[PDB]
Design a protein around this ligand. Structure first.
Ligand SMILES: O=C(NCc1ccc2c(c1)CCO2)c1cc(-c2[nH]ncc2-c2cccc(Cl)c2)c[nH]1
Length: 345
């Protein structure tokens, strides 16, 4: 068996000539040559069976990506694992191989307005399909946007994805949240569980702002610092937007703050396209009910060169799963059963 960065990567005989790409807490990704299709692929080794959270994320992603098929969404081409539950210590997911990601690009590359326009179009085109399946990504950020040498974009990492549940979205003030801080919508810190489509739109808005200047727009250093960065730019919420927040602790926190004026988008982004800033404003709307939806965003004048709703496909049916109260052993069983279709037997 081939070894990489001092770890076993037993994917053979089908996949050979492994080269390191990157890694996570419970996984590792390598590039490898597919001997059947005669192409280099990306292989993600995951070792999640020791922690139930890692099992839940592994299972959510495998189930979703096996039902999804879209040009702007990473696929699962094959799954390698041992033939029995007992012998299965790791799972290997064979996926699209991509040269870079938007996090990597933004560290060193200035994006032309045409690149920002095309990247945003592909993000929203992929997002339309995800939302049409009644699924929320819930962790959109530049490192979850993969790009190949011709600028084709694919959304990856569905580990934190959920089925949309807008009727059970309300919660208390400063409620614990898992998704990446800098891309969190203001309502997460105030009264939302992140169970509505508007949560993904906010993250896309943050990504657009980051593409315009190569810097995250709201780089909070801790939980409540995130809301203060957002308010620092949007300004104080209006009476109407406050009246939509019925939770007293959340509302009174906003009321306790001195008045702050909105920082104009053309002051933060003086070289940006005016149509891009108009769309940014609509994605970065404080009130999640007033926030632009993915299909409206696609129809915005800024994306007129690409907009074609007949070439922006939707899922063949909504998604339906309950993994919250399932032990790591039972989740191992479901990972085994979900990956059975790829075994030679
Ligand atoms: O699933 C992918 N990315 C998210 C991810 C990566 C590692 C990991 C977890 C999630 C949970 C535990 O460990 C993924 C990326 C790719 C990919 N294809 N081509 C390049 C890349 C890639 C680019 C940058 C970093 C990494 Cl890890 C991979 C394929 N799948």
């Amino acid at each position: 068996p081939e070894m990489v960065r001092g770890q076993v990567f037993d994917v053979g005989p089908r996949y050979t000539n492994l080269s390191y790409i990157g890694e996570g807490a419970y996984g590792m990704v390598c590039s490898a040559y597919d001997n059947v299709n005669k192409v280099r692929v990306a292989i993600k080794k995951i070792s999640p069976f020791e922690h139930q959270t890692y099992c839940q994320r592994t299972l959510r992603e495998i189930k979703i990506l096996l039902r999804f098929r879209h040009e702007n969404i990473i696929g699962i081409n094959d799954i390698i694992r041992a033939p029995t539950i007992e012998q299965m210590k790791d799972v290997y997911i064979v996926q699209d191989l991509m040269e870079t990601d938007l996090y990597k690009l933004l560290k060193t590359q200035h994006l032309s307005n045409d690149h920002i326009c095309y990247f945003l179009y592909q993000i929203l085109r992929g997002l339309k399909y995800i939302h049409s399946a009644n699924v929320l990504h819930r962790d959109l950020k530049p490192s979850n946007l993969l790009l190949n040498t011709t600028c084709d974009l694919k959304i990856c990492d569905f580990g934190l994805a959920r089925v949309a549940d807008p009727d059970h979205d309300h919660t208390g003030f400063l409620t614990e949240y898992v998704a990446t801080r800098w891309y969190r919508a203001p309502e997460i810190m105030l009264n939302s569980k992140g169970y509505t489509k508007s949560i993904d739109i906010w993250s896309v808005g943050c990504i657009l702002a980051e593409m315009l200047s190569n810097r995250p727009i709201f780089p909070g250093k801790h939980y409540l610092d995130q809301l203060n960065h957002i308010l620092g730019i949007l300004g104080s919420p209006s009476q109407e937007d406050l009246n939509c927040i019925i939770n007293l602790k959340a509302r009174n926190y906003l009321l306790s703050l001195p008045h702050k004026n909105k920082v104009p988008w053309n002051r933060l982004f003086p070289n940006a396209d005016s149509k891009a800033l108009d769309l940014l404003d609509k994605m970065l709307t404080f009130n999640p009910h007033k926030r632009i939806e993915v299909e409206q965003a696609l129809a915005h004048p800024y994306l007129e060169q690409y907009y074609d709703p007949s070439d922006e496909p939707i899922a063949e049916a909504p998604f339906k799963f309950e993994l919250d109260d399932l032990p790591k052993e039972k989740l191992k069983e479901l990972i085994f059963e979900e990956t059975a279709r790829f075994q030679p037997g």
